[PDB]
């Protein structure tokens, strides 16, 4: 069945959505650990805005803490609590 | 509260997830239309695999058709049915 225009619009508009983010992206300076799992499920801003002069950004943010296996190759591993930014509310704002 | 290691692992493992894909990405050769909405909600493969030699890819695929506003700037606009690839099943496969 065809998805209807107003549905496509409504489901795709700038909102917080479960997004799988690579941990190396959130901690770009880790030159020592490999992570397992290598990505985490975070609420983040996704979708699109009416104008192309607008962009989809977070208004309200919060932290979530997850247990990740941290491996230093040939040197050891442990489970460590790591913190990630989540987006609770998004809005379309000027660039 | 802390998300537990086996939960993080289970929620992040290679599976089909609702993903907001830019339409210009799925139709990279459209040098004529602007699209509204500019992105669509598609099931696609996301997450991560146990090895870094593995990657997360689709096994089973299907098509979905959505009504999108297609604008040719200064020249007109209409609603058009566009087709997008969805992923019904994903698995971790060697690179």
């Amino acid at each position, epitope marked *: 069945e065809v998805v209807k225009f107003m549905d496509v619009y409504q489901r795709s508009y700038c909102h917080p959505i479960e997004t799988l983010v690579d941990i190396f992206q959130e901690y770009p300076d880790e030159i020592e650990y*490999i992570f*397992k799992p290598s990505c985490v499920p975070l609420m983040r801003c996704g979708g699109c805005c009416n104008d192309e002069g607008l962009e989809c950004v977070p208004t309200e943010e919060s932290n979530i803490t997850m*247990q990740i*296996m941290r*491996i230093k190759p*040939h*040197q*050891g*591993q*442990h*489970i*460590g*609590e790591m913190s990630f930014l989540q987006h609770n509310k998004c809005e379309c704002r000027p660039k | 509260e802390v998300v537990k*290691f086996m939960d993080v692992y289970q929620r992040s493992y290679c599976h089909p997830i609702e993903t907001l894909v830019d339409i210009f990405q799925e139709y990279p050769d459209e040098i004529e239309y602007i699209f509204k909405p500019s992105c669509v909600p598609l099931m696609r493969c996301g997450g991560c695999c*146990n*090895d870094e030699g593995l990657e997360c890819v689709p096994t089973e695929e299907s098509n979905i058709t959505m009504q999108i506003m297609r604008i040719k700037p200064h020249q007109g606009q209409h609603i058009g049915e566009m087709s997008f690839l969805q992923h019904n099943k994903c698995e971790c496969r060697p690179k």
Partner: antibody, heavy 121, light 112 residues
Framework: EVQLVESGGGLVQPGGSLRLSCAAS????????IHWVRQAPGKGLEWVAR????????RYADSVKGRFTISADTSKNTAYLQMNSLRAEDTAVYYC??????????????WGQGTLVTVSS | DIQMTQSPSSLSASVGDRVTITCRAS??????????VAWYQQKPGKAPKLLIY???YLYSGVPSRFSGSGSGTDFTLTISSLQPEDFATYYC?????????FGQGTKVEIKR
């Protein structure tokens, strides 16, 4: 099944040499660390050496560093511990043990049966 | 590189009792870190068997009266309902910083 079988122990004179073998079945040691652990009579477990077979990286306990050499032949699926300059304190049961990598690194779940090395004249 | 100090050195307990064995890391490690200790059971003259891995996970085919927990520097192995077959020496192992070192062992005697 997954298995390790040691051989090559026995009696050896002080100052002498001995080579221990460890044959892996059911898995490829290329995906693995292979370790030697020893137990002197009535004493605790003592980690002694480790090899990463693919790249041939080795680590050793201070008590044996310079005298012992660990290696692995990936094509025979076998690991070795060359022991030189033996002393009374090296008398022990010597175990081979496997650790996996990444999510497969959780502990020594596969051991050999142990081989007694006795250093005496 | 860390050493583990394991305690007690020996203990004696009755069938059905709760046995608690402890492993402490030599360096200061925050409570946010966990999952770096394995526990083994060694019957006399045999190879050790893995009981618990990553601090708290029960290895396959090991009776569920064995459990483990810990964080920071402090790890615990618990046998919730001691059985006669549980006579053994128990060892911890750290892999926070490898090469992975063992504790000195806890000899468990069954009091009958």
């Amino acid at each position: 099944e997954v298995q390790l079988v040691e051989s090559g122990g026995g009696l050896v004179q002080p100052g002498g040499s001995l080579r221990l073998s460890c044959a892996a079945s059911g898995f490829n040691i290329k995906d693995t660390y292979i370790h030697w652990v020893r137990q002197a009579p009535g004493k605790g477990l003592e980690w002694v050496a480790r090899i990463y077979p693919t790249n041939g990286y080795t680590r050793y306990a201070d008590s044996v560093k310079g005298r012992f050499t660990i290696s692995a032949d990936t094509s025979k699926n076998t690991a070795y511990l060359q022991m030189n300059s033996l002393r009374a304190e090296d008398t022990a049961v010597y175990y081979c043990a496997k650790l996996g990598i990444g999510y497969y690194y959780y502990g020594m779940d596969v051991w050999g049966q142990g081989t007694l090395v006795t250093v005496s004249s | 590189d860390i050493q583990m100090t394991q305690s007690p050195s020996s203990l004696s307990a009755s069938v059905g009792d709760r046995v608690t064995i402890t492993c402490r890391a030599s360096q200061d490690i925050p409570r946010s870190i966990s999952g770096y200790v394995a526990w083994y059971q060694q019957k006399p003259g045999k190879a050790p068997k893995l009981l618990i891995y990553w601090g708290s996970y029960l290895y396959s085919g090991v009776p569920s009266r064995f459990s483990g927990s810990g964080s920071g520097t402090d790890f615990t192995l618990t046998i919730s309902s001691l059985q006669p077959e549980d006579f053994a020496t128990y060892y911890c192992q750290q892999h926070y910083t490898t090469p992975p070192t063992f504790g000195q062992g806890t000899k468990v005697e069954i009091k009958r």
